[model samples]
Target: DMYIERAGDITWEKDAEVTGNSPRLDVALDESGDFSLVE
Candidate 1:
């Protein structure tokens, strides 16, 4: 079967810095983990 969904992460991979943007799209993690966008 086939389906559509927003899927995508990491464990300590989260240990690394991360970020996101809709100028296209992206994610970021720090201290704990998280993200943002720009215009």
Candidate 2:
């Protein structure tokens, strides 16, 4: 399962569970709408 939450104009939070492991990742959107890892 996965969930997406908007944090700002170009930032978001990604919460997901894969193979029983859950991770929350910070993401950002670029000019072309492509996403990249924040850190």
Candidate 3:
């Protein structure tokens, strides 16, 4: 499972709504969100 957090305001929140699974890589918003995959 993966945890989503509301951040960059210097705080972390793991609200129960963001539920999913991740093993190596992940996802983002459709029209604009950027992603970078690394090891």
Candidate 4:
């Protein structure tokens, strides 16, 4: 979760939606992996 705002500035809120089977990383032996969530 994250939030961004400024003093005395217009503000808004957003929600993310994720669906379906998520994909997996095909990491090789002794390798590193990273991922990010999005909707």
Candidate 5:
């Protein structure tokens, strides 16, 4: 588990969605070995 906050705007990739004020995103390693947000 992790916690993160921003004083400014945030953006995610094409398949990702921002859920709430404090979002608890599920993440995983993509095929390219890059971090990705899981829905």
Candidate 6:
């Protein structure tokens, strides 16, 4: 018999700065589904 653990999916968007003074988008994923969108 075999045991499996920690299976999931991941997704990401464009990390772009449209304006010269614009910021960025930094995100991440952990064991759970959660992240942060910063600019």
Model 3 bad stretches (over 4 Å) = 1-8, 14-16, 24-39
Q: How accurate locally is residue 25 in candidate 6, as Cα lDDT from 0 to 100?
A: 71
Checking candidate 2 for backbone clashes, the offending pairs are none
Any runs in candidate 4 off by more than 4 Å, and if so which?
1-32
lDDT of 5 by residue, 1-39 (tens): 999877876755686766768767899997899998888
Ranking by TM-score: 2, 5, 6, 3, 1, 4
lDDT of 6 by residue, 1-39 (tens): 999997776755588656666656787776788786645
Query: Tens digits of per-residue lDDT for model 2 on 1-39?
Result: 999987768645477444566789999999999999998
Model 3 vs. true fold: TM: 0.20
Number of the top candidate by lDDT?
2
lDDT of each residue in 4-26, candidate 1, tens digit only? 98666433564676777646455
**lDDT at 38 for candidate 3?**
50
lDDT of 3 at 20: 84
Model 1, poorest ten-residue lDDT window? 30-39
Give the clashing pairs for model 4: none
> Who wins the TM-score comparison?
2
Span of ten consecutive residues with least summed lDDT in model 3: 27-36
| lDDT of predicted model 4 | 0.58
Candidate 3 C-alpha lDDT tens digits along 1-39: 999987568556777478688676654445566665554
Q: 15 in model 4: Cα distance from truth in Å?
A: 36
lDDT of 6 at 11: 57
Clashing pairs in 5: none
- Reference-based lDDT, each prediction: 0.58, 0.82, 0.64, 0.58, 0.81, 0.70
Clash pairs (backbone) in predicted model 6 = none
